[PDB]
Amino acid sequence: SVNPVVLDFEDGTVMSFGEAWGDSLKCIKKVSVSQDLQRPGNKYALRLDVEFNPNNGWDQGDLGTWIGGVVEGQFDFTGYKSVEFEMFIPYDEFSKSQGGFAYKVVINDGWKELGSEFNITANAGKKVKINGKDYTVIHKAFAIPEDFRTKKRAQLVFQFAGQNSNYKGPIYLDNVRIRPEDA
Ligand SMILES: OC[C@H]1O[C@@H](O[C@H]2[C@H](O)[C@H](O)[C@H](O[C@H]3[C@H](O)[C@H](O)[C@H](O[C@H]4[C@H](O)[C@H](O)[C@H](O[C@H]5[C@H](O)[C@H](O)[C@H](O[C@H]6[C@H](O)[C@H](O)[C@@H](O)O[C@@H]6CO)O[C@@H]5CO)O[C@@H]4CO)O[C@@H]3CO)O[C@@H]2CO)[C@@H](O)[C@@H](O)[C@@H]1O
Ligand SMILES: [Ca+2]
C-alpha cells in the first residue's frame, strides 16, 4: 500500500545527493551523474570521485539526500521495511589498491544506522563486466526497524570510510530504493 521511493538517477540528475551537512563530503571529492555504466534500461548512475589516504584507518565522508529534495522534511516510513542499493567499484584499480573501505547506510533522524560493512575489498560482492570494464558490485538491502516505520527526518546518508586505503577513483551508486519489501 506504499509506493517505493526509487532513486535510480534515470532523470539524468543527482536526485539531491550531495553533502549531508557543511563540509561532510571530505574523502568524496566530487559528486556527479554519469553514463559510465550505461546499459539496457539503465543509463545513469551516481559517480563519487573518492580519495583515501593509506595512513588513515577511518578516512570518512558522508553523502546525503533529502527525500523529495525537501531540506529538513519529514517522510512517513510507515509500511517501508528496507533500503536497498547497488554500489560499483572498478575492479582492476580497486584490486591493486591497499587496504579497504567501510560503508554505512543511515537514516539521519538521531543518526540511525540501518546497516554497514567493514573491510570491503575488490573480492566483495560479485564481479560484473559493464561497458568493457569489470566492477566489484555490492547489492544489499538493510532493514528499516519497526520503531522507524513512522514519520522521521527524511535524510538518507551513505557514509564511506577508507580503512588504510590508497584508492583514488570512482565509486558508483545506483538503484537506491526505499521499499515495502522486507530485508
Ligand atoms: O543539520 C541539523 C543539525 O545537525 C547537526 O549535525 C549532525 C549530523 O546531521 C548528524 O546527525 C551527526 O551524527 C553523528 C552521530 O551523532 C555520531 O557521532 C556518528 O558517529 C559515527 C561516525 O560517523 C562513524 O560512523 C563511526 O564509525 C566508527 C565505527 O562504527 C567503528 O567503531 C570504527 O572502528 C574502527 C576504529 O576507529 C579503528 O580504526 C579500529 O579499531 O578499527 C575499527 C574498525 O574495525 O570507528 C569508526 C569511527 O569512530 O561510528 C560513529 C557512531 O559510533 O556520526 C554522525 C555523523 O557525524 O551529528 C551531527 C551533530 O553532531 C549539527 O550540525 C546541528 O548544529 C544542526 O542543527
Ligand atoms: Ca540508473
Give the span between the Cα atoms of 116 and 106, in whole angstroms: 9
- Confirm if 121 and 167 have CB atoms less than 8 A apart: no
Q: Cell numbers at residue 111, please? A: 543518526
Q: How far is the CA of 38 from the centre of ligand 2 (A)?
A: 8
Instruction: Give me the count of residues in the chain.
Output: 183
Helix (H) or strand (E) holding 22: none
Give the span between the Cα atoms of 112 and 134, in whole angstroms: 33
- Confirm if 132 and 73 have CB atoms less than 8 A apart: no
Strand partners, 82: 143, 179
Q: Cell numbers at residue 92, please? A: 582492476
Residues 30, 33, 35, 39, CA torsion sign: positive
Which experiment gave this structure? X-ray
Where in the sequence is the domain holding 147, given as residue range(s)?
Answer: 1-183
State the ligand closest to the CA atom of 37.
2
Give the span between the Cα atoms of 101 and 124, in whole angstroms: 11
Say which CATH number the domain at 49 has.
2.60.120.260
List all residues 6 or more positions away from 146 whose beta carbon is below 8 Å from its beta carbon.
none
> Based on the structure, what is the number of domains in the chain?
1
Q: How far is the CA of 60 from the centre of ligand 1 (A)?
A: 9
Instruction: Give the resolution value in Å.
Output: 1.1
Task: Give ion ligand 2 contacts, CB < 5 A.
Answer: 8-9, 42, 44, 174
Give the span between the Cα atoms of 1 and 139, in whole angstroms: 25
Q: Which of 61, 74, 76, 69 is nearest to 23 (CA)?
A: 61
